[PDB]
């Protein structure tokens, strides 16, 4: 067959390039990253989305512990 169904995960350093990853997408440089089709399909990823982790850590006591256990498998 063809190679359109191959799962792919990619990491970007500048978010605005996300418009190029897909062809049947409604590209526009105004919508935030969390609305673009590649993100909501769980295909792209950028470090920029983790800036929000600061404030969430301060209010709730020990979220950071929970995330590490759930992700890195053993803390």
């Amino acid at each position: 067959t063809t190679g359109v169904n191959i799962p792919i995960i990619t990491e970007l350093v500048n978010d605005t390039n996300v418009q190029f990853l897909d062809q049947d997408d409604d590209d526009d440089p105004d919508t935030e990253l969390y609305l673009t089709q590649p993100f909501a399909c769980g295909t792209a990823f950028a470090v920029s989305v983790l800036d929000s982790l600061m404030s969430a850590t301060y209010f709730n006591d020990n979220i950071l512990t929970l995330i590490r256990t759930l992700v890195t498998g053993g803390a």
């Binding site: 418009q19 190029f20 062809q23 590209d27 526009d28 440089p29």
Partner: protein, 391 residues
């Protein structure tokens, strides 16, 4: 109140407010002191001035014009004038130019491009500079071509300088400029790309790294094709192996016409061909540069070399009179009669097929509206063919 968000607006408002406030306040103080008198002299020293006159007095003093038509006469007035001369002159010297500078940041090349019904147009983007633009225009609008109607529309990211402006003025009718960028999917609509004949992409041949330029051009191509699926595109490229990346675009249909030019491949090809017969490279490279006839009298080799370079290569269909004929017969007949050199013809079929030179009998004239290549002085002379009746 969120009315001011940017930086230039804040700077401008601050300067204006401070300047006007200082001016009016000092004028008021002079008005008071002058209309009244000095107290110790029992207010016997008064002078008559209106507020507007006081405003006028200060502007002359700050500017240093010093007309001397009106001036303060009281002790307090003179004292205040001395201290204000020490103070406000620096403000006037270093504020007015700032405001004059901040106003006047107008982008001259906004706006869009109206579309004219019944007339095609193209759009050009990429590495734009004086030399490239001049060469491109000089070749594109040459008169040896048949009369043309297309309108060129540039689109770049850096505002032009004076010489380039002068060039645009000299071609005021056929050339228009706009400022923007291809990657922004608003500028494309702003230049009405959805109804355009084609889209060229110049490239910077003299680059530091060939691969970065290729990546940038591929990005431009994918953005344009994303905006509009079906549009002719012509692109320059700097490495041979990078050409394969173009085929990965899902809608790059070269079969319907989408051509890429690889400079390295063509250069090496010309040189290699010259390795067989000398001078072939310089003889071929003159068949694509539109030049007119030049006549000289002094009997030097230039007198013949220029007659040589006056030629170009064109293409046109063939008259119906050549149905059942052999390629050699057709070629020699065209030569002797029309003074035209017919080098090669394509073969119409279910698939694309072009033959260079054909022996007789092997391939008679198909006469299926066949297309033939030619060499001539200008496009006008080629139309002598396709009209060949029994005249």
């Amino acid at each position: 109140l969120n009315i001011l968000k940017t930086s230039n607006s804040i700077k401008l408002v601050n300067l204006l407010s401070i300047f006007i406030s200082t001016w009016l306040t000092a004028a008021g103080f002079i008005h008071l002191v002058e209309n009244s008198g000095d107290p110790w002299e029992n207010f016997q020293n008064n002078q008559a001035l209106t507020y507007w006159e006081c405003v006028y007095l200060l502007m002359v003093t700050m500017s240093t014009v010093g007309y001397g038509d009106v001036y303060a006469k009281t002790t307090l007035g003179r004292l205040f004038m001395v201290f204000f001369i020490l103070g406000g002159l620096a403000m006037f010297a270093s504020y007015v130019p700032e405001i004059i500078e901040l106003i006047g940041n107008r982008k001259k090349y906004g706006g869009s491009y109206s579309a004219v019904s019944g007339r095609k147009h193209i759009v050009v983007c990429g590495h734009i500079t004086l030399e490239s633009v001049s060469n491109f225009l000089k070749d594109f609008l040459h008169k040896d071509r048949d009369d043309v109607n297309v309108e060129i529309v540039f689109l770049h990211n850096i505002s032009p300088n004076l010489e380039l402006e002068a060039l645009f003025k000299r071609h005021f009718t056929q050339v228009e400029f706009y400022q923007g960028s291809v990657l922004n999917p608003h500028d494309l609509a702003r230049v009405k790309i959805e109804s355009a004949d084609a889209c060229l992409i110049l490239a910077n041949k003299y680059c530091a790294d060939p691969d970065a330029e290729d990546a940038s051009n591929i990005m431009r191509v994918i953005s344009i094709k994303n905006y509009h699926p079906k549009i002719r595109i012509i692109t320059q490229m700097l490495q041979y192996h990078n050409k394969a990346h173009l085929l990965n675009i899902p809608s790059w249909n070269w079969k319907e016409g989408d051509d890429a030019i690889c400079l390295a491949e063509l250069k090496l090809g010309f040189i290699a061909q010259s390795c067989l017969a000398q001078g072939l490279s310089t003889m071929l490279a003159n068949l694509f540069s539109m030049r007119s006839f030049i006549k000289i009298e002094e009997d030097t080799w230039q007198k013949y070399y220029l007659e040589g370079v006056s030629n170009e290569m064109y293409t046109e269909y063939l008259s119906s009179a050549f149905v059942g004929l052999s390629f050699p017969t057709v070629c020699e007949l065209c030569f002797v009669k029309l003074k035209l050199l017919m080098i090669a013809i394509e073969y119409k079929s279910a698939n694309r097929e072009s033959r260079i030179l054909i022996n007789p009998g092997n391939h008679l004239k198909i006469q299926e509206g066949t297309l033939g290549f030619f060499i001539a002085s200008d496009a006008k002379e080629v139309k002598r063919a396709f009209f060949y009746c029994k005249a």
